[PDB]
């Protein structure tokens, strides 16, 4: 007589979660931002995903982009509305090195242009793993000699996001922050794993500092 | 065009909404699905697995 609908894997994971945010200012040629895509830089979504060993899902991407006026000396700063470009560069593709780089032509790379004041941009991504499922944990190495990189980072080859101001700089600098939100959809999960107990320490491995199993009480009969 | 009227909630981003969005990779050919043991469909399945209780949770 009580349904378990809200404890489904879908309902548990199909909620948008911030995975990273980056900043960039319009006052330099290096005024762009980059982020190597990964789900291990935030505690909450990482812990939710790491309840399982293997996952297979589609992804909904939503960006929240906000700007702030930086100090300036010009009288009467009056800036038009700002337009932003976010470009996805799959591994092996050319990467931008400056705001006015030729790589922003995005002839084949998927890119999104969005103007401030509108609804947040949003796009969908399919399951893009070379394997049959995403891996949350990998007890192995990248090299056949068992030297070098050990762990889950060997399987992270998902590419890089690049972000920049489209508008040319005006009479005052503008600093913008882009917040990236991941929402898994059509999720399939396998091999449940104990929830993470020790606090996370690093992005690329499972390193931890030992912590007690629970909080304590005075005696075995204390209520 | 067809006359429309926008209601409250327009342009909002609610983290628990359920809408369709354009795909950034049209006609992407996903890797075929493979049978993996231990499929989980509900968190209650995890909650129904016995785990050892730390009843003697004294500070030592």
């Amino acid at each position: 007589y009580h349904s378990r609908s809200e404890s489904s894997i879908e309902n548990f994971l199909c909620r948008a979660a911030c995975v990273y945010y980056a900043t960039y200012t319009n006052n330099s040629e290096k005024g762009y931002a980059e982020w190597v895509i990964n789900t291990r830089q935030v505690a909450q979504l990482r812990r939710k995903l790491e309840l399982f060993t293997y996952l297979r899902f589609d992804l909904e991407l939503t960006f929240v982009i906000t700007s702030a006026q930086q100090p300036s000396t010009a009288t009467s700063v009056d800036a038009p509305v700002q337009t932003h470009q976010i470009m996805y560069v799959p591994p092996g593709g050319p990467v931008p090195t400056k705001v006015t780089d030729y790589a922003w032509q995005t002839s084949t790379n998927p890119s999104v242009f969005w103007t401030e004041g509108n609804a947040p941009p949003r796009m969908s991504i399919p399951f893009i793993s070379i394997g049959n499922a995403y891996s949350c944990f990998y007890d192995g190495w990248t090299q056949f000699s068992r030297n070098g990189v050990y762990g889950i980072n060997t399987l992270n080859n998902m590419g890089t996001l690049y972000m920049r101001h489209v508008n040319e700089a005006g009479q005052g600098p503008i600093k913008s922050t882009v917040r990236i939100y991941f929402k898994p959809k059509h999720v399939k999960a396998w091999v449940p794993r104990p929830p993470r107990l020790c606090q996370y320490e690093k992005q690329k491995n499972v390193n931890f500092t030992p912590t007690g199993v629970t909080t304590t009480r005075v005696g075995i009969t204390t209520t | 065009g067809l006359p429309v009227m926008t209601t409250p909630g327009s342009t909002q981003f609610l983290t628990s909404d359920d809408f369709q969005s354009p795909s950034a990779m049209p006609q992407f050919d996903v890797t075929p699905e493979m049978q993996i043991p231990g499929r989980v469909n509900n968190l209650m399945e995890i909650a129904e697995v016995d785990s050892v209780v730390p009843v003697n949770n004294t500070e030592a």
Partner: peptide, 17 residues
């Protein structure tokens, strides 16, 4: 509407509920 897919890709569909 009630349920109509607007896109040609399955990844564009809403969640499985």
């Amino acid at each position: 509407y009630t349920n109509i897919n607007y896109y040609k890709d399955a990844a564009s569909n809403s969640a499985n509920r």
